[PDB]
């Protein structure tokens, strides 16, 4: 039937947070180490991911209630979910006609091959690309896209979470907002909520394979040295 002011407020907060941390001009990308097309794209993509991690952190800090988690819990959530949030938010540059992420310039058009030249295999890139395609076809409203990122960040079922109850309740509030939003505002969305929760499951699997391949990278110092300090901290295994 309708949404409450508290719920509508959450949507507004999330949408603003995302506009504040996602720059459609991609003008900052020239400041990364340039793309080169053994492992020639690793410097450029490591910089891209490092920058994106800062952006996800800025997004998280503006999720209602995230700030009020303990610092361990905030780190716990971010360490396990960063690569997933990056995969979600990257859908906004993904194009179906190119099967690539198009970030303004032709030098910042990442086809699948570019990502192979940064150390990954089709065991990751193939599901990643089909994931982007299925997600792009959902034709998500901005509100739904940002709600999913928030919901994904605030999953209590991450290793290292201590205040399980608090985070779960937060995630409950967001799911309720999403499920309500879709009902009232998304014409023909009767099945959209379940399609989105499935993508959260898909992201867990992409996280797993990514962590596998990142391990192989980081165990070769001649490649890990190309990463950034932020990437090493976030994707690393410290507790």
């Amino acid at each position: 039937h309708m949404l409450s002011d508290e719920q509508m407020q959450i949507i507004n907060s999330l949408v603003e947070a995302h506009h504040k941390t996602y720059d459609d001009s991609y003008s900052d990308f020239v400041r990364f180490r340039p793309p080169v097309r053994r492992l020639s794209m690793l410097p450029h993509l490591a910089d891209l991911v490092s920058y994106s991690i800062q952006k996800v952190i800025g997004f998280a800090k503006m999720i209602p209630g995230f700030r009020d988690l303990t610092a361990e819990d905030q780190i716990a959530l971010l360490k396990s979910s960063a690569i997933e949030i990056i995969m979600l938010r990257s859908n906004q540059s993904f194009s179906l006609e190119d099967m690539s992420w198009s970030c303004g310039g032709p030098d910042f058009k990442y086809c699948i091959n570019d990502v192979t030249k940064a150390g990954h295999t089709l065991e990751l890139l193939e599901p990643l690309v089909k994931f982007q395609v299925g997600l792009k076809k959902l034709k998500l409203h901005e509100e739904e896209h940002v709600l999913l990122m928030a919901i994904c960040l605030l999953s209590p079922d991450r290793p290292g979470v201590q205040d399980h109850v608090r985070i779960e309740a937060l995630q409950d509030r967001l799911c309720d907002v999403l499920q309500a939003y879709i009902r009232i505002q998304h014409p023909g969305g009767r099945l959209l909520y379940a399609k989105m929760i499935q993508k959260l499951a898909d992201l867990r699997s992409l996280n797993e394979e990514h962590s596998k391949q990142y391990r192989s990278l980081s165990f070769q110092p001649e490649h890990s040295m190309q990463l950034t300090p932020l990437v090493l901290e976030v994707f690393g295994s410290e507790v």
Binding site: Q54, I75, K79, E238
Partner: peptide
């Protein structure tokens, strides 16, 4: 550890 993350999280 998590020196950068703490800082960025303020």
């Amino acid at each position: 550890r998590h020196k950068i993350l703490h800082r960025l999280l303020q």
